[PDB]
Amino acid sequence: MKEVVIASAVRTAIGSYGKSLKDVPAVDLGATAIKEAVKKAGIKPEDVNEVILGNVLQAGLGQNPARQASFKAGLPVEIPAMTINKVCGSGLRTVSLAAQIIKAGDADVIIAGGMENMSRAPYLANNARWGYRMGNAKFVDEMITDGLWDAFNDYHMGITAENIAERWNISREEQDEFALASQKKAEEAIKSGQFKDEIVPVVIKGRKGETVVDTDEHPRFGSTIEGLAKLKPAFKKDGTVTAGNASGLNDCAAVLVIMSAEKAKELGVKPLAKIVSYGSAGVDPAIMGYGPFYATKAAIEKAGWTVDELDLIESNEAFAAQSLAVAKDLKFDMNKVNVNGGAIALGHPIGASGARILVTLVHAMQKRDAKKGLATLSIGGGQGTAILLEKCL
Amino acid sequence: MKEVVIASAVRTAIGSYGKSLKDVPAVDLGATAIKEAVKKAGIKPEDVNEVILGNVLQAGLGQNPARQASFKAGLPVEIPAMTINKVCGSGLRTVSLAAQIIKAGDADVIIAGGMENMSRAPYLANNARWGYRMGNAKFVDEMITDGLWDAFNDYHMGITAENIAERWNISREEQDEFALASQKKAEEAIKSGQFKDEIVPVVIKGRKGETVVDTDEHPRFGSTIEGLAKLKPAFKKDGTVTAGNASGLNDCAAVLVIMSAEKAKELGVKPLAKIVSYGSAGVDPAIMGYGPFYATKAAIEKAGWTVDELDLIESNEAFAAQSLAVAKDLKFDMNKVNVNGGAIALGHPIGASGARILVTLVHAMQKRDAKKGLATLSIGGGQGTAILLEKCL
């Protein structure tokens, strides 16, 4: 059926929790990204058929956050929009959903991606409507409940990472080493300009004037192995997962224009990459960090490739323990993986994260002249999503 | 392109706000409906390839509510699931998304539909995370914010209904006469058993015994025109929209098994209807209730049909004002519209509503032997979505 291409790929900088982007709602991050993605694609906003955006922490954001980003971007009100929640997978799944809708014959141009502002998540009173009646209750952190807590096992995602570390014997030192390598690669990438083509600046209009945020602030420049080794376990006693070898709580939007190859040609667009195949898979929730293994194999099976064939891989770093397990099992050449750093350094804005690694992948492919790329990531609740790209000449 | 069929269509009863389903989470409503939809389709849980469910009031429901419903229904962990938010359209749009994925070649059997428990929606504190510092603040009703408030114009959905009453010159009396006829049709339908096939019971098992809910709670039997005429306006001074000519706040889940025709044949399934075509469209948010006009026209054009060819129509009754505007402009034969009553009587459980009308439409097409059917509904934020069905021989 129809061939599907990426026309443009843009993201905001990734803000740290409570920091640079704390005053910028997710839908405004999304709007910023959508407007620049349409500009970079060289198409008219009236060319767009649908908007499909990932967002996990929807609480109190108002009706249909994807529609709000679309409106705030200046897209025509006649364009339909919907918000997707697949937890960590959400922003990458909207890209394969776009490809599906285009393959189905129903659209030619779709805005896809994700947006999250974890800094802005509310607290909840679940029984305020009809009453608590008597006794103390929980004032619930919505970011943890909706984003970070396994709904079946009643523990944090971090415990799923410990579960993998324990089953696979991925040691603290192996996790810390992996974290250090991610940090060094992010520092090198930031300072050498690797992210300039993909980052749209966010212009913040405060009281005392305008501020511009255009750089990823989560990396820890000058990280050392001894500094990593001093940290304490974050999730259990004598555990292996720490704040230094797990990603953060972060804010970002990442948006792509997805088109049929035929429409792209008709509109004079020069695509960045072809979407060759994709997949999604479920796993036991207790080992969610493993979901990429099954999503990636299904997708590769469709592509007719092998892992050795891949020139660049983005495999998300929610936790070193999970990235290492997926890497061992799929036998990745680690030199081709997260070549500009990964989420331990860069951050993990949940609803945007999978879109964010895809933006990073397609730019890196364009700059290094790589042919075959893979983007894949784990999903809270025990899933995975993967997309395979082939560069356009 | 693969043909796509509805294998089964099941819903819970529609509960009134704070009443019969107040103690049943949306995901448990969803799991009840999934389990019965799978049974009715005559398939096995392992035949399901993906779960895609609408849910609007996601706040504090935990990671990926669709995934939770799937797991609770006894579907395998390996199955991917995602939660869709298109406000009122959510539960209908997952069905057309299911069709699109099957058409794209990526699945044969998908659980679709929606779930909502408005009674259970939390209250929010938006600045509890970093602090209020000083001064009173808003304790935010999440049901209103995320479900019922226009994000662009900063007023209730009820004001958009008033806007349509004014611009289409639809009187208070016209709205009331419409409401009364819905109430009468619902009463007659309920008492003659029209919904008995489609409704799956919900068993509420507390500490001390069990209660069965299997009937729609919201209808006001013995409604009168004088009873309606006396009501106060709900949304503005001297308004035309009231509690009597607007739908309610309600709890429900509605689920369909969606399959390719070839898979249904292989598995021995006797499908209820073919999905012929579908459409989504945007409109000014200020008149969101007109959304179905454009969505319906798109879907009819794509099907190669006409409005006059339709045998049964489900056009959602979010407000009489909007239902009447849509019916006038599409020139519906009103004896074919909402023949078992509509949402003014039955309720509007936002995330499920779209799926609920489709369930009602397919059962009514079976019972009345009607060949061509339309389901369509308005969407807060200025959208509409529609699906066209053709009965299976």
Residue numbers in the entry:
A (entry chain B), B (entry chain A): 1 to 393
Paper passage:
Here, we present the crystal structure of C. acetobutylicum thiolase (CaTHL), a type II biosynthetic thiolase that catalyses the first step of n-butanol biosynthesis and condenses two acetyl-CoAs to acetoacetyl-CoA. We reveal that CaTHL, unlike other type II biosynthetic thiolases from aerobic bacteria, is regulated via modulation of a redox-switch, indicating that n-butanol production and the relevant metabolic fluxes in Clostridium are tightly regulated by thiolase. CaTHL consists of three domains: an N-terminal α/β domain (N-domain, residues 1–119 and 249–269), a loop domain (L-domain, residues 120–248), and a C-terminal α/β domain (C-domain, residues 270–392). The N- and C-domains form a typical five-layered fold (α–β–α–β–α) observed in other thiolase superfamily of proteins including peroxisomal degradative thiolase from Saccharomyces cerevisiae, β-ketoacyl synthase II from E. coli, and the biosynthetic thiolase from Zoogloea ramigera (ZrTHL)14151617181920.
To further investigate the role of the redox state on the structural properties of CaTHL, the crystal structure of the reduced form of CaTHL was also determined using the C378S mutant CaTHL, a protein that cannot form a disulfide bond. The active state configuration of the reduced form of CaTHL was similar to that of ZrTHL, in which the two cysteine residues involved in the disulfide bond formation in the oxidized form positioned apart with a distance of ∼6.4 Å. The catalytic cysteine loop in the reduced form of CaTHL moved back to the active site by ∼8 Å. Accordingly, the flexible region was found to be highly ordered, forming the native sheet–turn–helix conformation as observed in ZrTHL. In the reduced form of CaTHL, the positions of two catalytic cysteine residues and the conformation of the catalytic cysteine loop were restored, resulting in an active form of the enzyme.
